[PDB]
Symmetry: C4
Subunit: 197 residues, 4 copies
Amino acid sequence: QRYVRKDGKCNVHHGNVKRAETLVFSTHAVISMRDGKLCLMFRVGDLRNSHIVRASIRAKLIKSKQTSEGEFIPLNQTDINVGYYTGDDRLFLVSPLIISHEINQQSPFWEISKAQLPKEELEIVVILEGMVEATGMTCQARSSYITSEILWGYRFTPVLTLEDGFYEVDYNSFHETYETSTPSLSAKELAELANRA
Amino acid sequence: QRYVRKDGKCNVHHGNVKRAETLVFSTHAVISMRDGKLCLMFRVGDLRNSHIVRASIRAKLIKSKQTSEGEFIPLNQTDINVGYYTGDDRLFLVSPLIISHEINQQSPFWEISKAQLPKEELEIVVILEGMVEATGMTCQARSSYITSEILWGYRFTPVLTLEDGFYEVDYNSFHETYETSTPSLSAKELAELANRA
Amino acid sequence: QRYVRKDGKCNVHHGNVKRAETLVFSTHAVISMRDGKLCLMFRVGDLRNSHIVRASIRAKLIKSKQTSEGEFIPLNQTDINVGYYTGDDRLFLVSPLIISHEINQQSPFWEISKAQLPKEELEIVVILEGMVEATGMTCQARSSYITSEILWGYRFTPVLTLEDGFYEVDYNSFHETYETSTPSLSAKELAELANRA
Amino acid sequence: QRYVRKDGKCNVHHGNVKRAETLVFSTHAVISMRDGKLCLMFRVGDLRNSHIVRASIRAKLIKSKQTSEGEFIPLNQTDINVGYYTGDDRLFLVSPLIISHEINQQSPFWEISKAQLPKEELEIVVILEGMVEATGMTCQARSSYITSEILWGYRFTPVLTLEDGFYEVDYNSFHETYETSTPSLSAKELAELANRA
Ligand SMILES: [Mg+2]
């Protein structure tokens, strides 16, 4: 049962679809484990009634900082890895996608535990760029996740199923998350413990 | 006998050319050895009566997976390497090109043998992006290869020859493949065996 | 107090705003320490009355050189790293940003000390590229810093504060710098000394 | 004496300027030493009466090959490194630039000596892409160097001088080359010999 037909069209139905511009980014982001790595995740959706093409996702952490020399930098900006090194930030965006940032040694979240998170003053800006297919007109969409909108120990509720030849997207579940057993340690300490043996 | 003239034009004739939109991607993909590496290959063609410019190729594996923590991800998407790291995904596309994905340790096909392949539930989406030369208008074309459309132990029939000052493309051979002696081991086991001595 | 609203708009006020085209690049660049690394920095601003989108920054060192084989290359051009490897050269440009080039072993400034700098015959060209949001029309802006416009031992005066729900930009401070305690050694010798113990 | 003014304009005069479209690529390419590395070089020029913006250069080697398994690939295409890894392929193109490909272990020219070169059946396609500044209209220009158009032991004659506040480009020298003392060994053997001691 193919997703993409030989003629370039998709066997996808967008069901239970709400203002279009509220189905671009999930209201919340989540942190939980995937294949042994702690990941920060958010969901992104296509434009309704118009497919987005040449799509790419980027993310910036905005967070005040002070250098060791004492320079205060208000709302310092730094790039959050969501696939730039591998080309995974170039999206094939038909049905909604969970974008995943692996919290590793290069992530600004490396040292942040479940207990520490709500004490942080931070904001993740997410930026989706691309082009309207039918128009060749460029577009950008943006949103953000402040500290309280990042849910530790949660995954996204899946939205995609296969029904009678159509891959069905239930947009009623676009924004929904559920709790799952998750460590409360920071990624750094989780790794250190795995490395012991 | 040059392919590209000093004036920027090409000495190429597009022969035996069929609906234009059926000569963008080969109907099938193939797996066989090239210079000691197992490769997954598909063929791509230019637009007829209009040269494509700023051309680039990308490929995504669509395949359901479950994380070790038990999260089911329907039709999980991951990028397949077709030249991003070297710039080889930026095409000079006049006569048809065989795009090659080397099956190495980072390839999602690394552990898949000839016997295992038909048991896999997967789909490779291929995406060609660029711009119509005469119009400066952007374009995208897409297709896909499901499991049964990937032929293990085959190469593409060449289409290009030199005839009286013209490089001749025989589009009668665009889609044709032929069988060739190929190992049935997975790339992983082929490598392990080469590494022994 | 969020910078970016869920609706994609920003809580930023551009205050005390002067010809728009004089608030694109700081008149001067500076060199000083950040978290133990010597950095060359310059400030960039958005377009007034029109937000710039898909923004990116690049920088070129223009400087005559002679190869060891004796070839003189007038105004040889080489790229200066301002984020290409990490994606940090892709800007989210609303309030003004300090662009930072870390002076490391790959920087053309690696061996240049405070005393040597004014003896150098060089020019840093800075190039901001992007697209006007409301128009989808592309744009480029350029400027440069000759030797005397690079200030060793200085930082930029911050411009951003939080006032009554708005992040306030004081463009009166866009161009201003202040002196700060800074080593006069070249980055190379600073590193060598840190490496001793 | 600055090249780029604070207002973004350049202090460059394009002198002794011929059909515009013949001053895009040098008729020939050259091979000679630069700072101990053997380099393949060609010259590129801006469009006359219209500055090119967002400019980038790429290069492809076209050369038939046979795999060790016996597959013949007519006019196989592979990317030639002219700055992709560092961003040096993104040009600031006002006065003509010498594009340099370092012949290292990853270059398809690594094993080719002065005596071997004329025996090779090959063609380097060069592709300049960008946008007309005044129009925001995209453009591409292409040319190529066959075997006999690659001159071993030559450099380009410089074109740029400083005269009364203007950097002067002498387009009479755009295409001219001169002979210089150069090793005749392949880059590979040159390196091996340097490595001995
Ligand atoms: Mg890149």
